[PDB]
Amino acid sequence: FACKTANGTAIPIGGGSANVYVNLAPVVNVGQNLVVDLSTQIFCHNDYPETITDYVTLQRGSAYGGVLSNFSGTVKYSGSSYPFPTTSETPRVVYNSRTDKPWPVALYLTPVSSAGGVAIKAGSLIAVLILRQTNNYNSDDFQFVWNIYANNDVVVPT
Ligand SMILES: CNC(=O)c1cccc(-c2ccc(O[C@H]3O[C@H](CO)[C@@H](O)[C@H](O)[C@@H]3O)c(C)c2)c1
């Protein structure tokens, strides 16, 4: 089990860390959502699908910078949504193919009442998402740590 990103970096067997750089809607109103879809950013696969079933969770999702200060919301994982920043570990998604498969995580972030002006700065860390991978074969329990950075400013109109 290993993963790759849309910026040409990777995390090998056993886990580790990578940076992810996301383009963001440049304008988000109070009462609306900024959607940060990581399923176009992070992809993983199973290295022995004939024999091994890989299990993948979102173990933890943390907010940083402008997201931490200026937004609240939820994270959608494989069709179900949970509070973000996270308060538990999600259910498992199965990886059962050698073919790249997206990690089905998306953030739905809505501005807090006091947000206004530039609410997320270009280049800044906005989140850290921990993918936990286990399997039905051995005791492997690995963390794939994804540091999510904004490519651009996000403005919340006054
Ligand atoms: C055709 N293959 C073969 O004959 C063949 C023979 C002997 C061994 C393997 C093989 C390959 C990879 C293995 O572990 C890695 O991949 C797993 C699936 O993604 C993960 O669950 C693990 O955590 C880890 O990342 C493991 C444990 C075994 C394969």
XYZ file of C-alpha atoms and ligand atoms in Angstrom:
187
model
C 0.000 0.000 0.000
C 1.341 3.349 -1.105
C 0.062 6.737 -2.246
C 0.891 9.557 -4.664
C -0.227 13.157 -5.159
C -1.267 15.565 -7.875
C 2.011 17.455 -7.376
C 4.151 14.492 -8.237
C 5.199 13.492 -4.735
C 4.572 10.189 -3.036
C 4.521 8.284 0.235
C 5.855 4.710 0.098
C 4.965 1.516 1.918
C 5.043 2.181 5.650
C 3.706 5.715 5.573
C 5.346 9.074 6.011
C 4.393 12.626 5.009
C 3.693 14.657 1.897
C 2.606 18.159 0.954
C -0.505 18.788 -1.121
C -1.249 22.101 -2.849
C -4.835 22.960 -3.588
C -6.521 25.596 -5.701
C -9.388 27.134 -3.765
C -12.495 29.059 -4.731
C -11.325 32.676 -4.468
C -14.599 34.006 -3.029
C -16.724 32.292 -0.385
C -19.686 33.937 1.309
C -20.761 33.564 4.896
C -23.468 30.901 4.807
C -21.840 29.048 1.920
C -19.193 26.330 1.666
C -15.655 26.282 0.445
C -15.198 22.762 -0.895
C -11.692 21.293 -0.711
C -11.803 18.036 -2.638
C -8.754 15.899 -1.889
C -9.995 13.064 -4.116
C -8.351 14.940 -7.009
C -5.155 15.301 -4.986
C -4.420 12.037 -3.188
C -4.448 8.548 -4.694
C -3.497 5.168 -3.250
C -3.318 1.511 -4.245
C -2.979 -2.023 -2.845
C 0.311 -3.840 -3.598
C -0.986 -7.414 -3.132
C -4.698 -7.307 -3.950
C -4.856 -11.048 -4.766
C -4.359 -11.860 -1.096
C -4.506 -8.715 0.996
C -7.404 -6.361 1.705
C -6.244 -2.885 2.681
C -8.310 -0.798 5.126
C -8.062 2.988 5.035
C -9.457 5.560 7.449
C -9.289 9.272 8.013
C -7.751 8.972 11.488
C -7.553 12.694 12.183
C -8.252 15.980 10.439
C -6.832 19.177 11.895
C -7.323 22.805 10.815
C -4.573 25.415 10.574
C -4.101 29.090 9.838
C -7.044 30.811 8.214
C -9.166 27.683 8.240
C -8.659 27.286 11.973
C -9.404 30.978 12.612
C -12.073 31.774 10.062
C -13.999 28.612 9.199
C -15.997 25.749 10.642
C -17.559 22.788 8.917
C -17.402 19.131 8.054
C -15.386 16.497 6.282
C -16.993 14.069 3.862
C -15.355 10.640 3.771
C -16.638 8.046 1.325
C -20.164 9.425 1.228
C -20.684 10.323 4.894
C -19.896 13.570 6.672
C -18.365 14.234 10.075
C -17.358 17.337 12.034
C -14.123 19.035 10.936
C -11.746 19.360 12.798
C -12.441 15.734 13.469
C -13.564 14.246 16.751
C -13.188 10.520 15.988
C -11.713 8.161 13.418
C -13.871 7.341 10.409
C -14.968 3.919 9.206
C -12.658 2.025 6.870
C -12.636 2.199 3.088
C -11.330 -0.875 1.259
C -8.481 -0.711 -1.234
C -8.409 -3.898 -3.319
C -6.702 -3.034 -6.586
C -3.201 -2.217 -7.828
C -4.771 0.605 -9.830
C -4.605 4.109 -8.371
C -7.794 4.994 -6.509
C -8.662 8.417 -5.081
C -8.747 8.952 -1.327
C -12.398 10.060 -1.006
C -11.996 13.029 1.371
C -13.467 16.492 0.901
C -13.655 19.430 3.295
C -16.804 21.568 3.460
C -15.728 24.756 5.182
C -18.030 27.649 5.925
C -16.930 31.079 7.162
C -17.459 32.079 10.780
C -19.479 35.263 11.422
C -16.422 37.462 12.004
C -14.498 36.397 8.882
C -14.051 39.101 6.245
C -11.404 40.087 3.732
C -8.613 37.600 3.066
C -9.579 34.631 5.197
C -7.037 32.148 3.816
C -3.629 33.329 2.605
C -1.921 31.940 -0.491
C 0.791 29.468 0.409
C -0.441 28.841 3.943
C -1.051 25.529 5.673
C -4.804 24.950 5.981
C -5.050 21.385 7.205
C -3.314 18.197 8.154
C -5.113 14.972 7.342
C -3.934 11.623 8.676
C -4.742 8.556 6.611
C -4.449 5.324 8.593
C -3.793 2.125 6.726
C -4.184 -1.397 8.074
C -5.054 -4.693 6.422
C -6.430 -8.202 6.965
C -3.057 -9.891 6.654
C -0.541 -8.701 9.252
C -0.200 -6.085 11.983
C 0.791 -3.155 9.783
C -0.672 0.107 11.044
C 0.747 3.041 9.136
C 0.111 6.798 9.014
C 0.165 8.703 5.737
C 0.277 12.351 6.766
C -1.016 14.911 4.274
C -0.124 18.554 4.811
C -2.592 20.641 2.847
C -1.531 24.079 1.561
C -3.544 26.815 -0.155
C -2.361 27.820 -3.645
C -4.282 31.073 -3.504
C -6.083 33.568 -1.307
C -9.680 33.003 -0.327
C -11.772 36.101 0.353
C -14.962 36.300 2.400
C -17.034 39.260 1.259
C -18.227 41.845 3.732
C 1.942 -10.840 -6.552
N 2.408 -10.632 -5.211
C 3.079 -11.704 -4.483
O 3.256 -12.804 -5.002
C 3.557 -11.467 -3.053
C 4.321 -12.537 -2.330
C 4.739 -12.331 -1.057
C 4.420 -10.998 -0.374
C 3.725 -10.053 -1.024
C 3.456 -8.727 -0.285
C 3.486 -7.442 -0.901
C 3.246 -6.260 -0.111
C 2.987 -6.348 1.269
O 2.757 -5.264 2.145
C 2.535 -4.007 1.597
O 1.346 -4.039 0.822
C 0.171 -4.538 1.426
C -0.963 -4.469 0.408
O -1.027 -3.111 -0.088
C -0.109 -3.679 2.643
O -1.255 -4.122 3.387
C 1.097 -3.662 3.548
O 0.834 -2.815 4.672
C 2.326 -3.162 2.826
O 2.199 -1.799 2.432
C 2.980 -7.614 1.826
C 2.711 -7.790 3.290
C 3.202 -8.729 1.055
C 3.270 -10.277 -2.447
